[PDB]
Design a binder for these strands. Structure first.
Ligand SMILES: CCCCCCCC/C=C\CCCCCCCC(=O)O
Ligand SMILES: CCCCCCCC/C=C\CCCCCCCC(=O)O
Lengths: 194, 194
DNA sequence: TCAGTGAACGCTTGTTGACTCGA
DNA sequence: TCAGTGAACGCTTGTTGACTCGA
């Protein structure tokens, strides 16, 4: 219809919330009045879209989720080529973060700091990425010395590092080279296990 | 004097703030009125102690700092014994977290989520722990295949993991065994570099 | 039909000030 | 002398309701 305009106001409330966080503030400290004010609606209009600041947080987890998975697919595709595996995928990864900074900022900030419900949603997102990585290593036989249980712990290490790196990726020892160096240490670890 | 009582009210404002966070809330969303209410003073009494909720955050960074360094010293002492290095130090570490849960909770939550000034303070605390670890590995020749630059990146990986693990340490694949397994992967990585 | 409005609700907020009254 | 008080300041908050007016 022109309920294409409704969604446009939906995006506005979402984008305003993310961008309001860009100065150092947490999502939990944001008022509904200040988000509607930044998005361009009267306070009460917020409810034609969300009942809760919490419900907006959840839509913010779901939004990063689409973006983050479109990125993992591009890395997955790239893993089938012989050699250079790490450097290429870091690049694809950093490109995508660069292209989508405020979403990843939301993730980096709220991953442990928000209201429990939003922390639950982030936990689910992170278990799926970890599972998907455990499946992919299992599939390609990249760590032959690791059984199912050891892969789940390894995969969890890899996802823990990437997630712990996000904040320094947002705003020699340059991000790219460091993270790549750091992931190398972990891969080597995985190969020489026994 | 009995300005031993003043400090007691200082501890109360600090403890209340930390404990108010224990339900999922961020430090940034806490009002001064609710902290004084929980500590047992009239709102205005807060200023005989702090001018700012921010200044209280900074006293909360400094408090975790003493506790966290008393712990690192006990791990340092333990590193001079031949064998078992990892399992013992994890235990000492988890004991100390257990004994001081709400402080470490503060750290885990605010490490990327607070106001920039508190994020600065946490950054300084984390650089010092990372430097101290780089110095200690340098001292004992634990990673002979790594020059100064490589140690700073390794040390940063180790501190990144410990910090990224804190939240699951607060409230088979048990924390202790996982973290130990995960650190092993990293150590092995460090040894087989070249 | 319904996305966005404007007014009005009871309430909590950070900071002021001149105070009390025990160490 | 000064840690803690109690009242009062101008202001922002989440949610209500009956409304307007273009698609
Ligand atoms: C299969 C999707 C899982 C991707 C892991 C999560 C993000 C990692 C981003 C950059 C580093 C890529 C290295 C991944 C390990 C591949 C091992 C070969
Ligand atoms: C020297 C103090 C630095 C301590 C590192 C930070 C916290 C680590 C806690 C538990 C794991 C201990 C393993 C430390 C690496 C030692 C390598 C041998």
């Amino acid at each position: 219809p022109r309920a294409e305009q409704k969604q446009q106001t939906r995006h506005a409330l979402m984008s305003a919330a993310r961008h309001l966080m860009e100065s150092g503030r947490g999502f939990g400290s944001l008022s509904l009045r200040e988000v509607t004010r930044a998005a361009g609606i009267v306070p009460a209009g917020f409810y034609r879209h969300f009942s809760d600041m919490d419900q907006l947080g959840l839509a913010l987890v779901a939004e990063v989720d689409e973006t983050f998975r479109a990125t993992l697919r591009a890395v997955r595709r790239n893993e089938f080529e012989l050699g250079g595996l790490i450097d290429a995928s870091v690049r694809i990864f950093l490109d995508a973060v660069g292209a989508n900074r405020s979403q990843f900022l939301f993730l980096a900030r709220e991953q442990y700091g928000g209201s429990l419900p939003i922390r639950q949603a982030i936990a689910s997102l992170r278990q799926r990425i970890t599972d998907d990585l455990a499946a992919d290593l299992a599939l390609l036989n990249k760590m032959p010395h690791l059984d199912g249980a050891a892969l789940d712990v390894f995969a969890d290490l890899v996802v823990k590092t990437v997630f712990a790196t996000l904040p320094e990726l947002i705003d020699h020892l340059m991000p790219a080279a460091k993270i790549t160096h750091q992931l190398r240490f972990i891969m080597i670890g995985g190969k020489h296990w026994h």
